[PDB]
């Protein structure tokens, strides 16, 4: 019925590393179907998925 509390994950990576090759594969999402914080954490999950993708392909 519920999940664990969230970890810390301070700051943002997308506001820190513009030189990332996974950045063009990041913006296929949509804000306007859900509130801001749930979309923010969905962005976190998609970013760590694509980070795992880049580490796995390398």
């Amino acid at each position: 019925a519920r999940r664990l509390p969230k970890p810390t994950l301070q700051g943002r990576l997308e506001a820190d590393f513009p030189d990332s090759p996974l950045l063009p594969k990041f913006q296929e999402l949509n804000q306007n179907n859900l509130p801001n914080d749930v979309f923010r954490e969905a962005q976190r999950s998609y970013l760590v998925f694509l980070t795992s993708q880049f580490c796995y392909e390398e």
């Binding site: 019925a1 519920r2 999940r3 664990l4 509390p5 969230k6 970890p7 810390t8 994950l9 301070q10 700051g11 990576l13 820190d16 590393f17 030189d19 990332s20 090759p21 969905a42 976190r44 999950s45 970013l47 760590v48 998925f49 980070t51 795992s52 993708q53 880049f54 580490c55 796995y56 390398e58």
Partner: protein, 592 residues
């Protein structure tokens, strides 16, 4: 004046009759009694099935707003010696102990007449500490050592170093996330050779004792891999001795089993419980659930949240295999969409691997999780469960592993931001350079999503299947899928890992309140209000997760494992009390 000996073997003309094993006559005698026992228990009689699937709601819900702390009668027995067990004050416990094979409980008068129900005591160690004290079991283990000519390869030193390993309060919680990300896969483990080759090396230099003993897959991989001067020699010799112990003990158990078969199958699944394949190990990363459905003549029912799965043809409907990670590359984003857009409550899909085809027939991790580990460490660990998404967000939302222009061989602890990975790596103090954290994060492409707990209910053996009640010929067993069993927690560890791990007290050896009260601040109030529950034998556990009567290892095993001195004699005594009470168990015990 002839000196006739009277062995055990001449008593098998009465000790192997079925009339000793049917409790139907004694349940007729108990249920026709004009005055039954008034003190009924109603704590762990029947495993109720959960409707949801995630176990965090079961644990949190079970300990939320709880002020009732009832204990079962089997736990009430093994807490007092022989001399007062037969005292007339303890008639209320003596009233039901009337058969060694059957700890008969009464239940409840919730219907019309409360019926005395008999559950079969499976192994010989389920006899109470009154009628079978612990020193007798250690001396039977010393009989077992000389009867099979066992060669113990372990000394005292490896036993005491794993003992104070599991009593280390400052055990590194990062080792839990390494165990969680690998979770028993060979191709994932070879990705992390420079990870764990640095981990256990720096643990051996910081504290002298060895790490990663809280899972069989990791120590088996350390026995297979890494012998190429990766770790220091004296650290690796501990793991080699530990893995030699299990194969030596299994060879001793089959020397006990003997070279006789019934029909065509061996007798080894009748005499012992470790050699019985129908007993399952308490933690399963790869599939064994489809495997025992192919090999068992007694019909099991792997209940996955009131979903039965009793037949082998409906395998992919209930459990899918992830296989190796190379064929999954077409469905990485499909599995991610299953993660983020899946309803995991009321989800009865098991995300496991393939069944590995080893010659041992799954006996070594049963031995390691059942007779080795809870005796060298006195039953003081619990089975936690990870959330894979939160550790996935931990290992990839950091600085250097995301940028990929941060170079590989630099320290990660001086450029990682003040995230939870920083306080995870600070309290542990290892220095994993970035890149070995990269594939560590990249393992998330085929990690599971949650650590589900599942109640496999296998029937008894045909020798001890003589109860009239068809619901008690089954002896259930919970098995905590995809989660790792783990030692005690620091409060510094628990505060930074409450968003990573949640504790599940599921087994008699692996539900312990000294460790559960560390990594869970609900039982930390529960045993604060009920300090008598801090014993491992009287600890309350969720009956939808752990049914104590319907369990292979009952509370006398927890009484013996909590108070044994961790040494050779304790290990031999514990593996000598897993012998069943079958007639051919008496035969193979009379032979040796």
């Amino acid at each position: 004046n002839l000196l006739l000996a009277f062995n055990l073997q001449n008593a098998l003309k009465v000790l192997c009759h079925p009339r000793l094993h049917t409790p139907a006559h004694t349940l007729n005698s108990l249920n026709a009694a004009p005055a039954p026992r008034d003190r009924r228990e109603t704590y762990s009689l029947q495993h109720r099935r959960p409707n949801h699937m995630n176990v965090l709601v079961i644990v949190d819900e079970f300990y939320d707003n709880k002020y009732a702390a009832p204990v079962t009668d089997i736990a009430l027995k093994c807490g007092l010696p022989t001399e007062d067990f037969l005292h007339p004050s303890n008639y209320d416990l003596l009233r039901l102990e009337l058969h060694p094979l059957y700890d008969i409980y009464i239940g409840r008068d919730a219907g019309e007449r409360a019926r005395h129900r008999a559950v079969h005591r499976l192994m010989v160690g389920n006899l109470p500490t009154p009628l079978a004290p612990a020193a007798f079991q250690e001396a039977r283990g010393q009989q077992f050592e000389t009867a099979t000519s066992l060669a113990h390869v372990v000394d005292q030193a490896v036993i005491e170093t794993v003992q104070d390993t599991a009593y280390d309060t400052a055990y590194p919680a990062f080792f839990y996330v390494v165990e969680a990300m690998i979770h028993g896969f060979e191709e994932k483990f070879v990705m992390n050779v420079p990870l764990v080759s640095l981990c256990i090396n720096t643990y051996w230099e910081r504290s002298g004792r060895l790490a990663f003993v809280n899972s069989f897959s990791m120590i088996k991989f350390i026995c297979r891999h890494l012998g190429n001067n990766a770790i220091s020699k004296e650290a690796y010799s501990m793991y080699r001795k530990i893995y030699g112990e299990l194969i030596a003990l299994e060879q001793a158990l089959m020397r006990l089993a003997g070279s006789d078969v019934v029909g065509d199958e061996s007798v080894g699944q009748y005499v012992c419980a470790l050699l019985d394949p129908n007993l399952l190990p308490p933690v399963a990363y790869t599939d064994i659930f489809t495997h025992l459905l192919t090999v068992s003549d007694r019909a099991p029912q792997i209940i996955i949240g009131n979903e039965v799965y009793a037949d082998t043809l409906a395998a992919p409907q209930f459990i899918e295999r992830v296989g190796n990670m190379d064929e999954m590359a077409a469905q990485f984003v499909a599995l991610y969409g299953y993660r983020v857009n899946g309803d995991h409550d009321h989800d009865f899909r098991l995300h496991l691997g393939p069944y590995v085809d080893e010659g041992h027939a799954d006996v070594l991790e049963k031995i390691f999780y059942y007779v080795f580990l809870p005796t060298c460490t006195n039953a003081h660990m619990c089975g936690l469960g990870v959330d894979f998404q939160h550790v996935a967000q931990t290992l990839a939302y950091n600085g250097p592993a995301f940028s990929h222009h941060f170079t590989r061989d630099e320290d990660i602890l001086d450029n990682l931001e003040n995230g939870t990975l920083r306080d995870l790596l600070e309290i542990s103090d290892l220095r994993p350079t970035v890149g070995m954290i990269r594939d560590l994060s990249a393992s998330f492409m085929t990690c599971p999503t949650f650590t589900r707990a599942v109640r496999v209910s296998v029937d008894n053996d045909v020798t001890q299947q003589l109860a009239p009640n068809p619901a008690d010929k089954r002896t259930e067993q919970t098995v905590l899928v995809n989660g790792l069993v783990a030692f005690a927690f620091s409060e510094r560890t628990r505060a930074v890992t409450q968003c990573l791990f949640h504790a599940i007290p599921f087994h008699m050896f692996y539900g312990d309140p000294r460790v559960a009260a560390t990594m869970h601040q609900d039982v930390a109030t529960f045993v604060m209000r009920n300090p008598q529950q801090r014993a491992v034998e009287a600890f309350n556990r969720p009956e939808q997760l752990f049914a104590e009567y319907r369990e292979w290892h009952r509370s006398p095993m927890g009484k013996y494992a909590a108070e044994c001195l961790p040494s050779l004699v304790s290990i031999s005594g514990m593996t000598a009390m897993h012998i069943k009470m079958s007639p051919m168990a008496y035969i193979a015990q009379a032979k040796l």
